[PDB]
Amino acid sequence: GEVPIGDPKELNGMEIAAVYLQPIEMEPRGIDLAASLADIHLEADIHALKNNPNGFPEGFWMPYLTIAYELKNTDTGAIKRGTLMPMVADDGPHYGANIAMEKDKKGGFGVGNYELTFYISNPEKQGFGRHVDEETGVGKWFEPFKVDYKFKYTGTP
Amino acid sequence: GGEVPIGDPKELNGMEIAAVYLQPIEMEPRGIDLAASLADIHLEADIHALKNNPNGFPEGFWMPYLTIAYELKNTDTGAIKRGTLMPMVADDGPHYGANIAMEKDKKGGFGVGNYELTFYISNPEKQGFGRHVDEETGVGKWFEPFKVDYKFKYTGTPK
Numbered sequence: 351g352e353v354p355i356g357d358p359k360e361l362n363g364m365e366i367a368a369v370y371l372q373p374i375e376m377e378p379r380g381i382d383l384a385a386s387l388a389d390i391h392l393e394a395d396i397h398a399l400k401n402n403p404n405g406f407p408e409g410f411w412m413p414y415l416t417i418a419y420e421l422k423n424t425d426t427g428a429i430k431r432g433t434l435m436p437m438v439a440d441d442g443p444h445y446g447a448n449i450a451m452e453k454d455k456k457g458g459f460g461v462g463n464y465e466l467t468f469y470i471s472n473p474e475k476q477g478f479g480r481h482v483d484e485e486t487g488v489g490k491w492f493e494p495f496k497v498d499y500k501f502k503y504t505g506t507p
Numbered sequence: 508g509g510e511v512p513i514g515d516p517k518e519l520n521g522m523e524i525a526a527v528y529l530q531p532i533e534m535e536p537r538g539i540d541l542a543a544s545l546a547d548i549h550l551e552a553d554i555h556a557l558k559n560n561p562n563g564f565p566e567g568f569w570m571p572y573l574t575i576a577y578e579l580k581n582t583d584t585g586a587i588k589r590g591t592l593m594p595m596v597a598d599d600g601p602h603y604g605a606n607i608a609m610e611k612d613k614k615g616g617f618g619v620g621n622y623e624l625t626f627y628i629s630n631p632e633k634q635g636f637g638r639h640v641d642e643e644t645g646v647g648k649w650f651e652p653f654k655v656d657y658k659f660k661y662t663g664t665p666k
């Protein structure tokens with residue numbers, strides 16, 4: 351089961367929530383950190399709100415986002431950064447990454463209080479287009495932004 | 508509107524794959540597709556998950572990160588052109604599309620007539636989109652690359 355990370359945020363036509371679960375195994379291999387090296391799988395759950403201004407139907411997954419994360423243990427001061435990758439699981443597409451916590455050879459990423467930040471850029475950064483004609487067009491994309499969560503990490507689930 | 512349907516939708520590999528066309532559409536960012544003023548149609552592949560999709564996509568969801576090549580053939584004249592459909596969004600949602608010169612393309616016989624359209628579709632892994640494969644959260648293997656074809660009569664730009 352998935353453990354909630356903080357409270358979700360609504361902005362820029364999107365619901366942006368974070369969860370973690372046990373490490374997963376991803377194909378293609380050699381991209382996501384291997385499950386045996388990780389303690390959690392971190393997911394960003396990002397879906398269109400009602401009346402999304404960029405034309406995405408309510409509830410649709412928001413694709414082609416560029417997303418980085420920053421995870422800070424506020425007890426130890428340890429900070430790490432990485433990027434979340436687009437992928438699909440049994441419960442649909444998301445952006446995810448296996449992450450070493452206890453297993454991080456640097457130390458300091460064990461059980462404790464955390465701050466998580468997502469840094470998110472719009473689909474155009476990856477060449478995704480938008481109609482702009484009168485008949486079928488949609489509005490401009492958001493500028494890059496961050497969202498912050500606070501959570502307690504209680505150990506590899 | 509709306510979109511002019513091209514042939515009949517196919518249901519294959521856990522997806523509905525339909526083809527439609529509209530008038531040329533103005534797209535941002537500028538420069539990455541053919542300008543509207545230079546085109547006669549906007550061609551789209553309309554691709555969504557069926558129920559019981561074996562790759563974890565909920566019913567109705569747009570299928571993202573597909574690589575989609577098209578071949579458009581005028582069977583009357585012999586004219587052929589090939590291209591890629593690019594992912595983008597319109598007010599009614601995401602699709603794969605391209606502006607295409609028909610009558611305006613003086614390099615071939617792309618006028619009003621009988622057409623065959625083929626899509627060549629590769630799965631999202633070709634673009635590095637991932638899939639869980641662990642027992643707990645994993646999904647089925649991706650489909651191998653495949654083709655679908657449609658026949659339609661092109662009658663000119665919608666007007």
Ligand SMILES: [Cl-]
Nearest residue numbers: 356357499500
């Ligand atoms: Cl929070």
Ligand SMILES: [Cl-]
Nearest residue numbers: 514515657658
């Ligand atoms: Cl057909």
Ligand SMILES: [Cu+]
Nearest residue numbers: 437445446447
């Ligand atoms: Cu994942």
Ligand SMILES: [Cu+]
Nearest residue numbers: 595603604605
């Ligand atoms: Cu389009």
Ligand SMILES: [Fe+2]
Nearest residue numbers: 352393441444
């Ligand atoms: Fe999930």
